[PDB]
């Protein structure tokens, strides 16, 4: 019952009880709360609640000291205190943003924002508030009961009436009863188990509440400038593929933590790989949130880096199968690639975190907890997806909103920016570089002549609230009868049911935005299925387009970045 103050540090025994989280609030800061806010319930070694037999006064505004207990003023005694007076709550040891953090419900993107403009430890209240709040959110929505089982990846479903049912796409994981993990995708569903087990027809899932437990570290340790690298030991003799990374490899042993933005296919992963070549005996811990940008992370070591002296960290819950060539579980082998989520408790001379624009203030905290580091590297592009925020509803999330690393890549700048991309044929390394990068980033490749942009708003259905664009499609089809070459394209698009749709219709491989995120491919066909503000959005348009080696075809629905796609336009 005795801590320290969530907005001054000062000690105090007072804590909201009315928070979601419970945090210890000074005296100062504890009044300016209740004072401001509905929260009126404060506790110390007991709740400030009225002692008297049968009253049911908890409000601290009304309360008093009558010696040792608490009474309102109907039952306190002539000799008594008010609790609160003098800008004061009483208690042992005797804020505008942490009202607002405290009450919001975390529907709005002014929520997020404020959870990154406030001070730090401010951050840490309000990503551990909005986990909570996100975690018990998960309760509203009702159980999937197996009406009938059809075949080993389809079944019918049977929906608890009175609560609401949750999107049915990867993003929403169930858990099967304990028959393991289910996802479903669209009255015939499609599923899959991650232990491939004979479904019961009355067998049940459940979308799975995980405690939060709380943060201690901050999102970023303090900025610390070195005058000479620190606690590394440069190669003298480094091979010439990583020669272009010298420099940012000596920024990052010259300051505590370093942050590179890297657009698509500028070398993210040669540059997190290159840097255990030029610190050859560097301790480095290799993290990102997901297991797929992990597992890139794992390729690009595989080629580079001793195989012997690599662990890949798997948590016993295993959830999706990952990268199987390394020593797995070994965590004291000085290579360690590991999702946030699994890392355990360690010593670094380098930690890596990869992928940071998908990275929550959580993420930030639970990394600065569990790894204790010489120097933290944050890579990725805030011109990139973010994490879905599932509570998020009304406004947009900026990039500089979207984590501690975002907000510094987008105010102060990136301290390393690799500046070349050699994945993407120019014309969509020029359309993203004037779009997003304020035309910092050059084409290493020439113009391919096989980028084409297609104005069509076609028709949009919707199965629930995923968007279908069944004529977009159709002129793909038309597309693919003339261009044999994109019969391996990869399909994407910014809906799940769009894809679903595509895949019967065209069979070619089908993402989403979001999922294509890190993977390329030699063709793509997008189709932006509406004009929303989920498909408008720049940070997924940017990842759309800048996935494709070679070609790419835009349908596009949306006149602005149809025009600015540098595309031939095409026609029916
Ligand atoms: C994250 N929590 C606080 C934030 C202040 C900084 C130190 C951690 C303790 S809380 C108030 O959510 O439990
Ligand atoms: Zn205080
Ligand atoms: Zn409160
Ligand atoms: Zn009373």
């Known amino acids: 019952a005795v801590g320290a103050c969530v907005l001054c540090n000062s000690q105090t025994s007072l804590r909201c009880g009315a928070c979601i989280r419970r945090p210890f609030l000074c005296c100062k800061c504890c009044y300016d709360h ?63 943003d942490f009202n607002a953090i405290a009450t919001c419900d975390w529907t709005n993107a002014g929520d997020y924002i404020l959870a990154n403009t406030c001070t730090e430890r401010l951050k840490l209240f309000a990503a551990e508030t909005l986990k909570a709040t996100e975690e018990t959110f998960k309760l509203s929505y009702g159980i999937a009961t197996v009406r009938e089982v059809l075949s080993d990846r ?45 479904l019961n027809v009355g067998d049940y899932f459940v979308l799975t509440s995980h405690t939060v437990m709380p943060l201690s570290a901050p999102t970023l340790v303090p900025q610390e400038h070195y005058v000479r690298i620190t ?92 990268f199987d060539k390394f020593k797995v579980n070994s965590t004291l082998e000085q290579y360690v690639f590991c999702t946030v989520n699994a890392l355990p408790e360690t010593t670094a001379d380098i930690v890596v975190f990869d992928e940071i624009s998908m990275a929550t203030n959580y993420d930030l905290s639970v990394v600065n907890a569990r790894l204790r580091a010489k120097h933290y590297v944050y890579i990725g592009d805030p011109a990139q997806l973010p994490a879905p925020r599932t509570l998020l509803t009304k406004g947009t999330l900026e990039p500089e909103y979207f984590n501690s690393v975002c907000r510094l890549m987008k105010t102060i700048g990136p301290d390393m920016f690799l500046g070349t991309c050699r994945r993407c044929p120019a014309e969509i390394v020029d ?15 020439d113009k391919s002549a096989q980028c084409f942009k297609m104005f069509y708003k076609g028709v949009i259905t919707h199965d629930v609230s995923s968007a279908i664009n069944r004529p977009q499609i ?7 009868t003339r261009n044999p070459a994109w019969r ?39 189709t932006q299925t509406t004009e929303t503000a989920h498909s408008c959005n720049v940070n997924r348009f940017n990842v759309a387009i800048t996935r494709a080696k070679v070609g790419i075809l835009c349908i596009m629905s949306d006149r602005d970045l149809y025009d600015k796609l540098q595309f031939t336009s095409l026609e029916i």
């Open 231 to 322: 606690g590394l030991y440069p190669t003298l003799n480094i091979s010439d593929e990583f020669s272009s990374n010298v420099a940012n490899y000596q920024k990052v042993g010259m300051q505590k933590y370093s942050t590179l933005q890297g657009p698509p296919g500028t070398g993210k992963s040669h540059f997190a790989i290159g840097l255990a070549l030029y610190y050859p005996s560097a301790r480095i811990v290799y993290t990102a949130c997901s297991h797929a940008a992990v597992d890139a992370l794992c390729e690009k070591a595989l080629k580079y880096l001793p195989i012997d002296k690599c662990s890949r960290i798997i948590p016993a819950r295993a959830r999706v199968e990952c």
């Open 488 to 526: 391996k394209a990869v399909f994407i698009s910014p809906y799940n049911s769009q894809n679903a749709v595509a895949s019967k219709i065209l069979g070619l491989p089908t993402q989403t935005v979001d999922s294509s995120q890190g993977s390329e491919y030699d063709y793509v066909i997008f």
């Open 154 to 198: 389809e079944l019918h479903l049977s929906w608890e009436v009175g609560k609401p049912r949750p999107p049915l796409n990867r993003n929403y994981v169930f858990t099967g009863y304990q028959i393991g993990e289910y996802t479903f995708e669209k009255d015939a569903v499609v599923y899959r188990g991650t232990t491939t087990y004979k």
């Open 474 to 480: 159709g002129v793909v089809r038309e597309f693919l």
């Open 34 to 96: 209740v004072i401001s806010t509905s929260h009126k319930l404060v506790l110390s070694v007991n709740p400030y609640v009225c002692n008297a037999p049968g009253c049911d006064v908890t409000d601290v505004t009304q309360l008093y000291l009558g010696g040792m207990s608490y009474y309102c003023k109907s039952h306190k005694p002539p000799i008594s205190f008010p609790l609160c007076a003098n800008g004061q709550v009483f208690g042992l040891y005797k804020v505008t």
């Open 431 to 445: 359309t993203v570089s004037a779009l997003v990068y304020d035309n910092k980033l050059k084409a290493h490749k």
